Design a protein around this ligand. Structure first.
Ligand SMILES: CC(=O)N[C@H]1[C@H](O[C@H]2[C@@H](O)[C@@H](CO)O[C@H](O[C@@H]3[C@H](O)[C@@H](O)[C@H](O)O[C@@H]3CO)[C@@H]2O)O[C@H](CO)[C@H](O)[C@@H]1O[C@@H]1O[C@H](CO)[C@H](O)[C@H](O)[C@H]1O[C@@H]1O[C@@H](C)[C@@H](O)[C@@H](O)[C@@H]1O
Ligand SMILES: CC(=O)N[C@H]1[C@H](O[C@H]2[C@@H](O)[C@@H](CO)O[C@H](O[C@@H]3[C@H](O)[C@@H](O)[C@H](O)O[C@@H]3CO)[C@@H]2O)O[C@H](CO)[C@H](O)[C@@H]1O[C@@H]1O[C@H](CO)[C@H](O)[C@H](O)[C@H]1O[C@@H]1O[C@@H](C)[C@@H](O)[C@@H](O)[C@@H]1O
Ligand SMILES: CC(=O)N[C@H]1[C@H](O[C@@H]2[C@@H](O)[C@@H](O)O[C@H](CO)[C@@H]2O)O[C@H](CO)[C@H](O)[C@@H]1O[C@@H]1O[C@H](CO)[C@H](O)[C@H](O)[C@H]1O[C@@H]1O[C@@H](C)[C@@H](O)[C@@H](O)[C@@H]1O
Lengths: 134, 134, 134
């Protein structure tokens, strides 16, 4: 159609620790397949129910990446060194990409805060709305 | 218009406890009334300042529902069994619905984590952007 | 173009305390410049990695404002009087503005919860998608 909305969603990912960004499997939008080659994409990475396990102020970094690498990043962290319980910390990240540059895909990634294990066990999404410059 | 944006917003809701999803009153989009019958809707449920009261790791589940039921859901929870103070835990949930299936409305819902009372006493919104497949 | 997306992003702001909303420098969209004069804007304020310092349940209020003042606001706050460590508390706020009113700009603002110092030291964005009424 003339006003493309892209969406991918997951309900889980294998629990891993990583010092550097690794893909969140399944949060991937094939932009080239959509025939988006010019304009802008507003991309939302929505991880509403994550938690992190660890023993030194745990948390998770998340990123929106294209084939050109990370475009935006943010994290949550707990406020106790060893939380009584690793509570659910909703996380949203929003970035606008110029597709002209040579973007063929957008994806979600994550990485450990201070050696934390990274947990998704319910709904998470990666969404993009296509538009133009003003 | 040719590029509809739907929006509903509230500033409060009666405080309730519920084991199962109940509507957040006022967070409701009448899609049929808009004449949306085909394409996709990106729906954001934005509850930026909620809190939960309770005695067993309190929190709130939130959902986006259509007439076909829940499409996505997430929660926040505290990281203490009995928080010193029930702090404000911003919550965002994003989902993309294919409208063809027979969607006439989109709404926000909530339900208790472990018997928590659910509090909204400031701005919350439900938004939707209409588009098409790629 | 015929389907504008507006975007502004920062990576930091001078740390300040403020009893009333002050601008988050750099989170500002010039809507008049875009030639948006009618329809709707869905505006997201995305502050994914903030923290607050203070000694009385710290937190930050955030707002979306136009030339007509604040349209929506929300806050995060910690659940301890003096957090062990001021953890990162992702914050998103979404609002839909009718541009006809006389809107020339949209901006993000913030203010202190109970005298908190307000910290941004990584990516934050302010985004807007243009549409029409249904
Ligand atoms: C609240 C929580 O984290 N629940 C976890 C649980 O954590 C337990 C520890 O916090 C523990 C230390 O003793 O105290 C509690 O458990 C005690 C007791 O030990 C237990 O035997 C007894 O039956 O209950 C008491 C209550 O005080 C904590 O509850 O760890 C286990 C790991 O085995 C689970 O992850 C549990 O997580 C929950 O599991 C549920 C199924 O029983 C269900 O799926 C819940 O949704 C899930 O909780 C959610 O995820 C958690 C990681 C957390 O984020 C919570 O806020 C979420 O609601
Ligand atoms: C977790 C944290 O807050 N890290 C801050 C750090 O805070 C230290 C203090 O909080 C301290 C008590 O006041 O506890 C720890 O430090 C102890 C000890 O006191 C210290 O001397 C020793 O080296 O380590 C131990 C560990 O128990 C806290 O670590 O203060 C420093 C210096 O001022 C930093 O801000 C640190 O922030 C981290 O800094 C990193 C760069 O070195 C990096 O940039 C991290 O991203 C950043 O942490 C993040 O921001 C924090 C403010 C907090 O939000 C954390 O959750 C984030 O991950
Ligand atoms: C810090 C807080 O929660 N204040 C909140 C207070 O909570 C206390 C708690 O601090 C501690 O001492 O334990 C006792 C008993 O458990 C209380 O729970 O209770 C007060 C009395 O009802 C209020 O609820 C107070 O809430 C604040 O009230 C002021 C005006 O009185 C403003 O309206 C604040 O905005 C409001 O704080 C906001 O909501 C509270 C629930 C919390 O989310 C704060 O982080 C938040 O800023």
């Amino acid at each position: 159609g003339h006003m493309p909305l892209l969406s991918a969603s997951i309900v889980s990912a294998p629990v891993v620790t990583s010092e550097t960004y690794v893909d969140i499997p399944g949060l991937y939008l094939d932009v080239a397949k959509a025939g988006i080659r010019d304009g802008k994409l507003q991309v939302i990475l929505n991880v509403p129910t994550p938690y992190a396990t660890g023993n030194n102020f745990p948390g998770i970094y998340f990123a929106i990446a294209t084939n050109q690498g990370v475009v935006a990043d943010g994290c949550f962290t707990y406020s106790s060194k060893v939380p009584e319980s690793t509570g659910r910390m909703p996380f949203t990240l929003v970035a606008t990409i110029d597709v002209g540059s040579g973007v063929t895909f957008v994806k979600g990634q994550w990485k450990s805060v201070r050696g934390s294990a990274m947990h998704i066990d319910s709904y998470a999404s990666l969404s993009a709305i296509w538009g133009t410059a003003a």
